[PDB]
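Quick question: what would this complex look like in 3D?
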Amino acid sequence: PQETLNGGITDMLTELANFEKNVSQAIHKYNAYRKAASVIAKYPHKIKSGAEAKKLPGVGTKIAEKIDEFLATGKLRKLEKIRQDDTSSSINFLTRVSGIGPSAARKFVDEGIKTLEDLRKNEDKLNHHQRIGLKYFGDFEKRIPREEMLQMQDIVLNEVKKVDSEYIATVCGSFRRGAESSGDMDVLLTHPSFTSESQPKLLHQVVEQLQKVHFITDTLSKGETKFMGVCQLPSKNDEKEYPHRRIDIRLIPKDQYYCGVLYFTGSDIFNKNMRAHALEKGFTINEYTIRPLGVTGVAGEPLPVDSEKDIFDYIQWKYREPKDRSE
DNA sequence: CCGACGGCGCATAGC
DNA sequence: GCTCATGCGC
DNA sequence: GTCGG
Ligand code: NA
Ligand code: NA
Ligand code: NA
Ligand code: NA
């Protein structure tokens, strides 16, 4: 369905979602508004009344009344008032810096720090992550076209293999499902040396090599199993520079790699349906393992997995390649 | 009525 | 010094 | 905010 249809409602609900998360610190209302916004976005009819939309799952009495108001008037009073509230819109805005969440933004705005300029002039008050988020504010809200992601994939797969040909790496996310574009790069990594029951330098070596060929430009956080950082494609000689991009690299035991690959490929809606159907067959699937459930509902030991298909076989589903995992 | 709504790795008050 | 709750992103 | 036990 086009934005034509209910984009007004859907933008309204997303605005309300953002203020619940970033100002009111009400994550569950945030998700409630996002849940209503998406089911409505899927609705292939231009909504004509609050009551019509209240038939959808996740839209209830209050969003129903809000849609009535929008439809009669073209505005929402609460949204307009908050849209011109200096404190509220400043708090909401600063959370667009990766590393500033609702609490940091609240304390910044409480001290006069309201804008990127104010941040730029108060950097002794920012931690390392926030500093990087500030430095790359524009680049991080940009999207990543698929051809740049392939180019990025090429570098990551080539450099990982250079460090140790026994590593396995997969780029997951909507990219793996075929997406025309992406918001970041999510790399899952494993080695035969690393199992649930088994060195602390397997991730560091890949990160390091990727810094030496000057692909990874910055580190937001790094530990034994998860890396969060920044990368950038090499500029094409006398051409404009590429935008810096957000990259995550996670190191997973080999016996849980394919459950991890499954999960981080998604879709999110696909994952719910597969885990829903999996329980109807007596298994419980999480990020890590697939396990059988006894009659009294207690989980047994996780079964061997060596392919994505293994998990499909377990629950008696036909293999669906990532292209067909939209839901 | 009233609780659940995802849960975890890593960076950053209190003893 | 250390442990760990809170913040954050995902 | 919405849902459901
Ligand atoms: Na409903
Ligand atoms: Na944010
Ligand atoms: Na943020
Ligand atoms: Na080798």
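Answer marked as accepted. The pocket of sodium ion (ligand 2) is lined by residues A 95-96 (CB under 6 Å).
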